Amino acid sequence: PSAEEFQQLRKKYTDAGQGHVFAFVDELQTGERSQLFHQLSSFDPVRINELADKALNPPASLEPLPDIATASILDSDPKDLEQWYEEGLKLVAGNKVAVVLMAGGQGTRLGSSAPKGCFDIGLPSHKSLFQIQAERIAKLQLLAQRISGKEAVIPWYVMTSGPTRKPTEEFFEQHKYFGLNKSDVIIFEQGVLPCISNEGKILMESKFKVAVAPDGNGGIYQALLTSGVREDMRKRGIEHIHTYCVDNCLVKVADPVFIGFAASKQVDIATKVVRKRNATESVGLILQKNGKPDVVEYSEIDKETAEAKDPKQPDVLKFRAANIVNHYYSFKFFESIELWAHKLPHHVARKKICIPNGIKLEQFVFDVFPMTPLEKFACIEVRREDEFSPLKNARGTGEDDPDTSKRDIMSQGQRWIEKAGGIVITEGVGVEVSPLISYGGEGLEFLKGREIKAPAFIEK
């Protein structure tokens, strides 16, 4: 940039109240000066003032979702569960199923230097979360091929962000895309936003770098349009989309039961929950808030509401639908994004950010739920120990960490083997079962009668 191009950009920022981002220009080495110029040209400071103004200058009725919107792997008719599986697999076979992996988050409490998906939780195989999830895609495709005779494809749209993008692209590349075909793995970006003070002033990471953060998991909807991903899905003939977080080590990627369940209710949005078993669990819950599908924080649930027993089922809680951020969307729903993408608010996330101190402005993925007709919303309860194991904290926390994650995968593996007639001997811990061997506990008949000495790794 010329001196006059630079000064034009300094004026735009100063006029917007944000001129302090050039405060250290005098001491910058031209290359650094060039970087700040380009980074600052990607943001409109007026738009940032808008979002910051709405964010900083802005008793519900709670009922569970209606019986007609809900199901349970635990309680539903196994006949339904099996029909849903069979039908969901058919949609996979038809190449109608896509996955969006939400992998743009910075993960600032596990505090890895790498993207969370690269994390090695300590399994015998030493596989990353990325690889495990990819092998589930691979395995499910081969399962679908059995019934159809034809190749099945589930496109894997990996949503990253600025801080996550490049190292994720390099990791997938080094790992030869985990045995999937390149064309079927699509890495894309959500937008980022500068982090702001309590007074809405842009925060500086360095003298020549603005502190940025991804704009929330809710930024997914806009990012589908911007990245060109929704229209890629159009070309591919996608009709059904499964979306989850990279941190879930137990994720049933493109779960046919979930797809088959959602498709048969002809809903636009479905969700997975696990069971809340004790009233004191600090878990966000899916329910109707003011006659509308929503996710409500645990703090907003009074003692009496949390404690209430289900009248139709007195041994379990009335409000028990613990949110695991695991969603289905119809393609029809994705074509409606323009009509409401602007109706999603940026929330104030007070985090520790530079040169809790700051704010990250974030959209919430579930904020579209109350905008969605109750008749277009579904929810299925699943088994935690088969489906939900978040990597959220560093080792030594005792909760949602590498060890709980490893435990969850390795005790699943053992249990799967034991159900198939396998004899697991632990003179020592569990057994790691490769998704390339078993997606969901099937195809282990060959282990009947065999002694496996734990800890162990069953691989192709």
Ligand X SMILES: O=c1ccn([C@@H]2O[C@H](COP(=O)(O)OP(=O)(O)OP(=O)(O)O)[C@@H](O)[C@H]2O)c(=O)[nH]1
Binding site for ligand X (CB under 6 A): 102-109, 159, 214, 216-218, 247, 362
- The answer to whether 297 is a known ligand-binding residue is yes
Phi, psi angle pair for 426, to nearest 5°: -115, 90
- The answer to whether 260 is a known ligand-binding residue is no
Q: Measured from the CB atom, is 223 or 437 closer to ligand X? A: 223
Q: Measured from the CB atom, is 37 or 157 closer to ligand X? A: 157
- The answer to whether 343 is a known ligand-binding residue is no
How far apart are alpha carbons 121 and 111 in whole angstroms? 14
What is the number of alpha carbons within 13 Å of residue 160 lying toward its C-beta? Answer: 23
Smallest CA-to-CA distance from 220 within 231, 229, 212, 232 is with 229
- The answer to whether 422 is a known ligand-binding residue is no
- The answer to whether 102 is a known ligand-binding residue is yes
Rounded to the nearest whole angstrom, what is the least distance from the CB of residue 15 to ligand X in the complex? 29
From the CB of residue 72, how many other CB atoms can be counted at a distance below 10 Å? 17
Q: Where are the alpha helices (DSSP H) in 31-154?
A: 31-41, 45-56, 78-93, 129-148
| Pair 132, 275: CB distance under 8 Å | no
One-letter identity of residue 298: Y
Q: Measured from the CB atom, is 135 or 247 closer to ligand X? A: 247
- The answer to whether 392 is a known ligand-binding residue is yes
Q: Measured from the CB atom, is 105 or 435 closer to ligand X? A: 105
Helix, coil or strand: residue 62: strand
Q: Measured from the CB atom, is 350 or 448 closer to ligand X? A: 350
- The answer to whether 133 is a known ligand-binding residue is no
| Pair 19, 13: CB distance under 8 Å | yes
Six token digits for residue 344? 């999603």
| Pair 192, 161: CB distance under 8 Å | yes
Rounded to the nearest whole angstrom, what is the least distance from the CB of residue 359 to ligand X in the complex? 13
- The answer to whether 284 is a known ligand-binding residue is yes
From the CB of residue 115, how many other CB atoms can be counted at a distance below 10 Å? 28
From the CB of residue 331, how many other CB atoms can be counted at a distance below 10 Å? 18
Spacing of C-alpha 188 from chain mean position? 14
Rounded to the nearest whole angstrom, what is the least distance from the CB of residue 107 to ligand X in the complex? 4
Q: Measured from the CB atom, is 323 or 414 closer to ligand X? A: 323
Rounded to the nearest whole angstrom, what is the least distance from the CB of residue 400 to ligand X in the complex? 10
Rounded to the nearest whole angstrom, what is the least distance from the CB of residue 218 to ligand X in the complex? 6
Phi, psi angle pair for 328, to nearest 5°: -115, 140
Q: Measured from the CB atom, is 104 or 260 closer to ligand X? A: 104
Q: Pick out the residues of the known binding site.
A: 102, 104-105, 107-109, 116, 182, 185, 190, 216-217, 246, 284, 297-298, 323, 362, 392
Q: Pick out the residues of the known binding site for Mg(2+).
A: 182, 185
Q: Pick out the residues of the known binding site for UDP-N-acetyl-alpha-D-glucosamine.
A: 102, 104-105, 109, 190, 216-217, 246, 284, 297-298, 323, 392
Q: Pick out the residues of the known binding site for UTP.
A: 104-105, 107-108, 116, 216-217, 362, 392
